[PDB]
Amino acid sequence: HDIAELKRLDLAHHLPAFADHKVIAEQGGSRIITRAEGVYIHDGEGHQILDGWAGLFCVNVGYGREELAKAAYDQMLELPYYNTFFKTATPPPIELAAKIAQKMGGHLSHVFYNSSGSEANDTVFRLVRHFWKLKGEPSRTVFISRWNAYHGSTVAGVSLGGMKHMHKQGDLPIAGVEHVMQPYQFGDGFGEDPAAFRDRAVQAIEDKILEVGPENVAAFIGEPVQGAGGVIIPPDGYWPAVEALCRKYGILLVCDEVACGFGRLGQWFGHQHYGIKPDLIAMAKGLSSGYLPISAVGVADHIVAELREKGGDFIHGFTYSGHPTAAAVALKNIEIMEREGLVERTRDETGPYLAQALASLNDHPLVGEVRSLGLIGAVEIVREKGTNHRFLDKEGEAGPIVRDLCIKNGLMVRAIRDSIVCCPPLIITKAQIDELVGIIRKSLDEAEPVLRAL
Amino acid sequence: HDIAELKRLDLAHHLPAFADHKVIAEQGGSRIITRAEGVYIHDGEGHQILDGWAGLFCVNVGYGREELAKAAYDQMLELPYYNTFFKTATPPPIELAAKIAQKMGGHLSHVFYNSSGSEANDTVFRLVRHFWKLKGEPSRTVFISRWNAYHGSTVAGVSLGGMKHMHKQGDLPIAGVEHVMQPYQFGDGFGEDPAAFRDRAVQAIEDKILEVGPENVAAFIGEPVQGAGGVIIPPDGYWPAVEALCRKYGILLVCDEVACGFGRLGQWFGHQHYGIKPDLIAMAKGLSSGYLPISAVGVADHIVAELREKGGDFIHGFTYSGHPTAAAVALKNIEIMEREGLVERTRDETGPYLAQALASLNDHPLVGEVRSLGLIGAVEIVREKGTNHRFLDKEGEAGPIVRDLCIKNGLMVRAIRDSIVCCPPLIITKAQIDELVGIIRKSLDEAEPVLRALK
Ligand SMILES: *Cc1c(COP(=O)(O)O)cnc(C)c1O
Numbered sequence: 001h002d003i004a005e006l007k008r009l010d011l012a013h014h015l016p017a018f019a020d021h022k023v024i025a026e027q028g029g030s031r032i033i034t035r036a037e038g039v040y041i042h043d044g045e046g047h048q049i050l051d052g053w054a055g056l057f058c059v060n061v062g063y064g065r066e067e068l069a070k071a072a073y074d075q076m077l078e079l080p081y082y083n084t085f086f087k088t089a090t091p092p093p094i095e096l097a098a099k100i101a102q103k104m105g106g107h108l109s110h111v112f113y114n115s116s117g118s119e120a121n122d123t124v125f126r127l128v129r130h131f132w133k134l135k136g137e138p139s140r141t142v143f144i145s146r147w148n149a150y151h152g153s154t155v156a157g158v159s160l161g162g163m164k165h166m167h168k169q170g171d172l173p174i175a176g177v178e179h180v181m182q183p184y185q186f187g188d189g190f191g192e193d194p195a196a197f198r199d200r201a202v203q204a205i206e207d208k209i210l211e212v213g214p215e216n217v218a219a220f221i222g223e224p225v226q227g228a229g230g231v232i233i234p235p236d237g238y239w240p241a242v243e244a245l246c247r248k249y250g251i252l253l254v255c256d257e258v259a260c261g262f263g264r265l266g267q268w269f270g271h272q273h274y275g276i277k278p279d280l281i282a283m284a285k286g287l288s289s290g291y292l293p294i295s296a297v298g299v300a301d302h303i304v305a306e307l308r309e310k311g312g313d314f315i316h317g318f319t320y321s322g323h324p325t326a327a328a329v330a331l332k333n334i335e336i337m338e339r340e341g342l343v344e345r346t347r348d349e350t351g352p353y354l355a356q357a358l359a360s361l362n363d364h365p366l367v368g369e370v371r372s373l374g375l376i377g378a379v380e381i382v383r384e385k386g387t388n389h390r391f392l393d394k395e396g397e398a399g400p401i402v403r404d405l406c407i408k409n410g411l412m413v414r415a416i417r418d419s420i421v422c423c424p425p426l427i428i429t430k431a432q433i434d435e436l437v438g439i440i441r442k443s444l445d446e447a448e449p450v451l452r453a454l
Numbered sequence: 455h456d457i458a459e460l461k462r463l464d465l466a467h468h469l470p471a472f473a474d475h476k477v478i479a480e481q482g483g484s485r486i487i488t489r490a491e492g493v494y495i496h497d498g499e500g501h502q503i504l505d506g507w508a509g510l511f512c513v514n515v516g517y518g519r520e521e522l523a524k525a526a527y528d529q530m531l532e533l534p535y536y537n538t539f540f541k542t543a544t545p546p547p548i549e550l551a552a553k554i555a556q557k558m559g560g561h562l563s564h565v566f567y568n569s570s571g572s573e574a575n576d577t578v579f580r581l582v583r584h585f586w587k588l589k590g591e592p593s594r595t596v597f598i599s600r601w602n603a604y605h606g607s608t609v610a611g612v613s614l615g616g617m618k619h620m621h622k623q624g625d626l627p628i629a630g631v632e633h634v635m636q637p638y639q640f641g642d643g644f645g646e647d648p649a650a651f652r653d654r655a656v657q658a659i660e661d662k663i664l665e666v667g668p669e670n671v672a673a674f675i676g677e678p679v680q681g682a683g684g685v686i687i688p689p690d691g692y693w694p695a696v697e698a699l700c701r702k703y704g705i706l707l708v709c710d711e712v713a714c715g716f717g718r719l720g721q722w723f724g725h726q727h728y729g730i731k732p733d734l735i736a737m738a739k740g741l742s743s744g745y746l747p748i749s750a751v752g753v754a755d756h757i758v759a760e761l762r763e764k765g766g767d768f769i770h771g772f773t774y775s776g777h778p779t780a781a782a783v784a785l786k787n788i789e790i791m792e793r794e795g796l797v798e799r800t801r802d803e804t805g806p807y808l809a810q811a812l813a814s815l816n817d818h819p820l821v822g823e824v825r826s827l828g829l830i831g832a833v834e835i836v837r838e839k840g841t842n843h844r845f846l847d848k849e850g851e852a853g854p855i856v857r858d859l860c861i862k863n864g865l866m867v868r869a870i871r872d873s874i875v876c877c878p879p880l881i882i883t884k885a886q887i888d889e890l891v892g893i894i895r896k897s898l899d900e901a902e903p904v905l906r907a908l909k
Pocket residue numbers: 057115116117118119150151152153223227228256257258259260284285771772773774
């Protein structure tokens with residue numbers, strides 16, 4: 001590879017995602033990643049980087065899976081593409097559907113296929129509203145979400161999400177979406193009793209339901225753990241109370257499993273850790289470990305019963321819905337996870353080990369709080385020990401500084417506000433977990449003098 | 455494959471797209487497609503079917519490309535995925551970006567990556583509105599489209615599209631989207647002078663611009679040829695007049711190239727056939743010939759200038775934006791098109807031949823009109839020769855009947871209302887074009903007695 005040419009071509013022809021393109025230009029183009037193996041990334045100048053984010057919350061089985069490349073090759077030779085539009089289907093999405101249904105459990109029996117997690121939430125949006133029309137309750141149209149939630153980057157995905165700065169671009173959210181407080185203990189309930197803060201966050205949902213009018217509410221949607229929002233782990237008892245709220249007013253419960261799904265929290269889906277029974281779930285990312293684009297919506301049997309008994313077209317779907325090659329890779333990816341027991345390993349081995357390893361950072365003068373569940377975790381950066389006070393009293397200044405030192409020291413982790421977030425592949429060893437935490441501590445030590453000088 | 459078992463699993467676990475699931479259940483599950491080669495499809499019960507729709511307007515290089523399977527395998531070994539979120543990129547999307555920009559021409563210099571054509575229009579929606587905010591014209595928010603347009607299946611894609619029945623599901627369109635008449639001569643301008651009907655269709659866009667308020671309009675979006683709507687080919691002079699309209703009121707011109715792109719109309723992009731210069735285009739389907747999911751938005755240089763000069767995050771993108779394996783396959787797909795010259799072949803050879811072959815159906819008692827451009831075409835079904843009158847005076851009855859007979863006779867074509875539309879892979883031979891048209895005529899002959907017996 002000609003790295004200088006790829007950087008020039010990047011600026012001249014490529015618009016990266018979630019990027020300030022003035023910043024990209026000022027650094028002379030994007031940083032070129034050329035190869036990867038196991039849990040490590042290699043860039044244009046030869047630097048080995050421990051990928052503490054598994055690509056983008058997705059590469060769960062790790063890099064270097066020749067077995068997955070082979071699965072794609074074989075299916076592309078036999079049948080690279082056909083549609084599911086013409087009363088037709090192909091083997092791979094059908095066999096993958098039965099496998100996903102096995103992992104979803106409960107009444108989640110069917111899947112609708114898309115490509116990205118964002119589309120899956122578009123599918124949730126249209127299917128939920130169509131379902132209530134078939135049920136004879138057409139007034140049920142409003143979706144209730146939370147501030148700092150992330151549900152994708154489509155128009156509907158941004159609307160369902162709670163990123164106010166993301167809402168601005170596109171003049172979003174669209175109508176029929178409401179947002180309430182997030183159960184963020186460290187930021188918004190610091191010093192509150194967890195049970196009392198939880199009740200406040202649950203009550204905010206009920207207040208919104210009553211304001212909208214229960215007969216007008218279609219569903220509540222939420223991530224089991226808010227990933228892109230900074231690993232917001234809700235207090236104990238939050239999700240059971242939210243489910244009871246949904247059942248009380250007869251609204252659907254939707255869990256966005258795009259990040260929490262497929263082993264991230266020690267379960268096949270995040271909602272199973274909390275023992276709740278959603279009516280729909282969105283999934284992607286870890287579905288194929290990012291090896292090929294594919295996503296799906298898990299659909300409850302009683303939703304399918306309306307489609308099967310009332311009839312009528314559900315006028316919804318994408319060209320690549322059920323793509324046989326992407327489906328075959330996702331199927332093999334699940335089989336690799338089953339074979340190697342990566343879901344159980346996260347719950348019983350690496351998850352707890354990550355929790356103890358991150359807890360050793362608690363004594364650092366810059367660390368306000370560490371938290372983790374399975375193989376996702378966050379480290380809070382504070383200017384005053386024992387508080388949630390942030391440097392310059394302006395969240396987002398200290399974060400990037402610590403992040404850049406981690407990257408300089410060979411660890412790819414990201415800063416969400418002043419929270420350093422990690423999300424490594426599920427194959428990470430305990431020694432590599434110690435390496436990850438070691439680099440964070442090393443970067444915090446270096447960050448201390450520059451942060452004090454702000 | 456255990457076909458009976460797959461049908462069981464299909465009903466028990468799979469929700470197909472654009473489907474009546476009661477109908478699927480009543481037939482005992484979806485029809486299983488197992489393998490394909492060249493332009494032919496094979497199902498569970500052994501039937502060979504000429505794929506007159508190239509999968510779903512997408513399989514342009516045809517089936518059986520081991521070269522594309524190899525390109526995917528090699529890239530997945532070296533680097534299966536990394537993101538473009540962290541000021542990072544990988545070689546394949548960068549190399550694909552330069553190739554696409556070379557084919558787009560004009561001021562279309564940059565691409566933003568997604569997975570589906572629907573997402574591409576979501577990217578158009580947010581980028582156009584963000585662009586006008588950076589330009590200091592925040593009132594420019596409204597998109598103008600057309601009835602019977604198709605722009606995807608996301609909430610924004612359905613909103614931008616003009617399928618009224620699709621709008622109902624989801625209670626769409628969202629605010630800030632207006633729809634005007636489609637330039638459908640056969641259905642809505644039968645007996646009108648084409649130039650006067652064209653002017654009527656262009657004036658409806660201007661009327662909407664003035665109603666919304668020119669300072670409040672962000673862009674006009676349209677397919678060069680309306681694909682899913684039934685191959686609606688606009689009258690001559692329509693698109694040049696539409697471009698002038700956009701330039702007159704200073705609004706952006708967006709062409710949805712997801713179906714028309716990559717050789718379908720004899721050009722790398724449909725708008726190039728009409729000589730117009732859109733500010734943004736959406737592309738997918740033929741981008742990778744459907745071999746892997748990938749899509750892109752072509753972005754004009756002056757749009758990028760706002761991002762580069764004003765700065766600020768464009769808070770938009772997908773996990774698989776710029777997926778290296780999908781990009782490598784799309785790049786190899788374009789190289790196959792270049793090597794085999796399918797773009798020039800469609801413009802000069804197979805495109806005109808399809809028009810000549812379809813024109814032989816003009817003498818059939820059921821055919822009201824045939825039309826085509828490149829390798830997409832439509833055959834109108836009428837109950838009265840020389841009119842646009844439809845069987846039972848209710849569009850959509852005759853269509854499915856002729857379509858089902860085509861499928862029985864070994865040709866996969868679809869009926870849009872009472873229009874039989876074809877869109878075969880670009881590698882189709884002239885003999886296979888004659889086979890396709892022959893099966894259509896055979897099915898029309900068989901359909902004539904049952905259609906005359908309606909009611
Ligand atoms: C990543 C993410 C999405 C969006 O998924 P894409 O494939 O990038 O469109 C949606 N919801 C959650 C919880 C996510 O983490």
